[PDB]
Amino acid sequence: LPSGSDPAFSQPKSVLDAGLTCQGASPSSVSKPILLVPGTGTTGPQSFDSNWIPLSTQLGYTPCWISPPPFMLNDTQVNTEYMVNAITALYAGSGNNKLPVLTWSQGGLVAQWGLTFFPSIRSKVDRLMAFAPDYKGTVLAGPLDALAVSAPSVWQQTTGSALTTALRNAGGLTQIVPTTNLYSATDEIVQPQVSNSPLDSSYLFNGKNVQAQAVCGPLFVIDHAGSLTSQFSYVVGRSALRSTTGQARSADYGITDCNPLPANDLTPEQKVAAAALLAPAAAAIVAGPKQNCEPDLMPYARPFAVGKRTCSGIVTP
Amino acid sequence: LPSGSDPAFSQPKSVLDAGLTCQGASPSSVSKPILLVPGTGTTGPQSFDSNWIPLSTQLGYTPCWISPPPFMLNDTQVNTEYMVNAITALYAGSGNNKLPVLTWSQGGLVAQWGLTFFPSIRSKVDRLMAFAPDYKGTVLAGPLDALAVSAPSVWQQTTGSALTTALRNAGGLTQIVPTTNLYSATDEIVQPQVSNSPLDSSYLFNGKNVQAQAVCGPLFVIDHAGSLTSQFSYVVGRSALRSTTGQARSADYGITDCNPLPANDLTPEQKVAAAALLAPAAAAIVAGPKQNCEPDLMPYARPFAVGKRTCSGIVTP
Numbered sequence: 001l002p003s004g005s006d007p008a009f010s011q012p013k014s015v016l017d018a019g020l021t022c023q024g025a026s027p028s029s030v031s032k033p034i035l036l037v038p039g040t041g042t043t044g045p046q047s048f049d050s051n052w053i054p055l056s057t058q059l060g061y062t063p064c065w066i067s068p069p070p071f072m073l074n075d076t077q078v079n080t081e082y083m084v085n086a087i088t089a090l091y092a093g094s095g096n097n098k099l100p101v102l103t104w105s106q107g108g109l110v111a112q113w114g115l116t117f118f119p120s121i122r123s124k125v126d127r128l129m130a131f132a133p134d135y136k137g138t139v140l141a142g143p144l145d146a147l148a149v150s151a152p153s154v155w156q157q158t159t160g161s162a163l164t165t166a167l168r169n170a171g172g173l174t175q176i177v178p179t180t181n182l183y184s185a186t187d188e189i190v191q192p193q194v195s196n197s198p199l200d201s202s203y204l205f206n207g208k209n210v211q212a213q214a215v216c217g218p219l220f221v222i223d224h225a226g227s228l229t230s231q232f233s234y235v236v237g238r239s240a241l242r243s244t245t246g247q248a249r250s251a252d253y254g255i256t257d258c259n260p261l262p263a264n265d266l267t268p269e270q271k272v273a274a275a276a277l278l279a280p281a282a283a284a285i286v287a288g289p290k291q292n293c294e295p296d297l298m299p300y301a302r303p304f305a306v307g308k309r310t311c312s313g314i315v316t317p
Numbered sequence: 318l319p320s321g322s323d324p325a326f327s328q329p330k331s332v333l334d335a336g337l338t339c340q341g342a343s344p345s346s347v348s349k350p351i352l353l354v355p356g357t358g359t360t361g362p363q364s365f366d367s368n369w370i371p372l373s374t375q376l377g378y379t380p381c382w383i384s385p386p387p388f389m390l391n392d393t394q395v396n397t398e399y400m401v402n403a404i405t406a407l408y409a410g411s412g413n414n415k416l417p418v419l420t421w422s423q424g425g426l427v428a429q430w431g432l433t434f435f436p437s438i439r440s441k442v443d444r445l446m447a448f449a450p451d452y453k454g455t456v457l458a459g460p461l462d463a464l465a466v467s468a469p470s471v472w473q474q475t476t477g478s479a480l481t482t483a484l485r486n487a488g489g490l491t492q493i494v495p496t497t498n499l500y501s502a503t504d505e506i507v508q509p510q511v512s513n514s515p516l517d518s519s520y521l522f523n524g525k526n527v528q529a530q531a532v533c534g535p536l537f538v539i540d541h542a543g544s545l546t547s548q549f550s551y552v553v554g555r556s557a558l559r560s561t562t563g564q565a566r567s568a569d570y571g572i573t574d575c576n577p578l579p580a581n582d583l584t585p586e587q588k589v590a591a592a593a594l595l596a597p598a599a600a601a602i603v604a605g606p607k608q609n610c611e612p613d614l615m616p617y618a619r620p621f622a623v624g625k626r627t628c629s630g631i632v633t634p
Binding site: 140142143144146147149186188191218219221222223225226259260261275276278279280282283285286287290 | 457459460461463464466503505508535536538539540542543575576577578592593595596597599600601602603604607
């Protein structure tokens with residue numbers, strides 16, 4: 001993993017501050033704060049208010065989240081600035097206390113991206129619980145890319161992208177803080193997720209890698225969305241957050257905990273909102289920014305993807 | 318149910334012809350033909366070649382399909398003109414014989430729409446197998462609609478649309494030929510589909526209505542793609558295509574056919590392709606047409622949706 005000073009943000013702090021919100025407190029004056037990083041095509045609340053915003057206070061946390069505009073569709077590198085600035089603001093705001101990070105979809109990729117390239121936060125993140133993270137991107141972005149209607153982050157979340165290439169080559173496919181990766185082979189957004197090994201997009205070396213079909217058998221279907229919200233996903237999440245290691249333990253979950261439908265501690269209205277998590281996201285994408293090339297890598301990550309083709313051309317040293 | 322003459326086509330006869338194709342046979346020479354009508358944001362091949370085009374061949378039928386431009390995102394009334402000219406083709410081109418019709422998503426709605434408003438084809442359609450059809454549309458089109466980024470047919474597949482309204486009021490929520498409707502409650506595109514009753518968007522009166530949870534239990538998850546692709550879906554689809562009573566019944570399928578994953582009879586390649594059926598479709602919508610209103614109903618259907626607003630305004634006598 002890289003080292004030295006933290007690279008400069010491309011955004012002002014105030015712009016990064018405005019993307020961070022805690023439920024019940026001020027970010028820089030909070031206690032027991034958890035950080036929530038939303039998925040592609042969502043704000044923090046849109047991604048989590050039907051699931052982990054309530055469920056995290058059910059465990060004694062002040063829920064906090066970022067909402068990088070627009071709906072996580074812009075550059076993932078910029079999206080990461082919101083996460084890095086959040087953890088730096090939340091550390092001091094909670095009495096220099098290490099804080100947990102819970103993420104969905106791109107939120108995971110964002111987390112590991114910051115952890116890899118922004119060293120100062122590694123000693124400030126207690127742990128990482130990532131639901132359906134796409135550390136290797138997804139091949140399923142291909143058709144979107146082929147029609148040149150892909151958002152900045154959608155380009156970057158394609159398998160073989162310059163961003164994912166950079167993450168791998170900088171050592172980012174090995175966990176940097178204690179990490180738990182809940183995912184599924186039936187995921188209709190992220191693939192490959194099937195082999196239940198390091199071939200999988202959600203797998204980080206030295207981290208707790210839970211593919212659902214390995215704990216509930218070949219028949220068990222949960223999609224990309226369910227991967228975050230389902231009752232199964234809750235027990236794994238509850239485990240990871242409370243543990244003494246920083247990772248979820250196999251003691252806390254099993255076939256009894258294998259419930260595909262939305263979590264049980266959700267009001268019947270929240271169960272419907274979670275069951276339809278993908279619909280607003282899909283709308284945001286259809287309505288969001290689109291371009292015909294993957295965004296340029298910032299100087300800190302640029303040398304890790306030499307040979308790849310971004311908007312400015314072939315990445316060179 | 319309306320009758321008299323067939324409504325005059327808006328599409329040229331020759332234009333409609335180019336939409337139809339069969340695996341091996343001419344439109345005029347086809348033998349044991351099945352007509353396949355695809356989902357929203359797809360072509361015939363896209364929707365089916367990973368699932369029912371190859372399932373039909375093993376069964377005995379010569380697979381055929383329409384692919385209305387562009388990617389089923391145009392007016393559903395115009396999408397239907399493709400199926401009407403097609404049934405007149407596969408009938409006359411099979412030597413004056415009835416032919417089955419198998420459909421996914423909007424495909425079902427289109428079939429039932431033609432059956433409702435085009436008398437001539439009622440005599441020519443043997444049966445109808447519809448997977449996750451949306452005869453009452455879906456509510457999940459709302460966010461797209463609210464952002465005015467919805468294609469013509471996406472407006473029309475919205476719950477409460479002038480089109481779904483007209484369909485109910487001309488007696489189109491009753492099966493016009495023998496009809497089977499397989500669908501899921503965990504369907505993330507079309508809803509509501511949960512009550513296991515006539516409230517469900519897939520339900521037709523007098524039709525064989527199979528909801529997957531009403532046999533596999535309230536923990537069986539298949540999504541909008543699964544509804545077409547699963548092995549479960551193969552058994553029910555085969556049953557209906559083999560029944561002398563026009564439709565499937567419970568004797569042909571049971572708890573041992575609760576297989577959510579793609580059809581076992583498909584090649585590993587086809588089983589991977591079928592699992593990712595949605596990705597091209599989504600990409601087609603992102604790249605597809607977009608407007609801020611539901612398309613005007615053609616004069617043959619317009620009186621059955623008095624009060625509703627379309628692009629030209631509110632409908633009146």
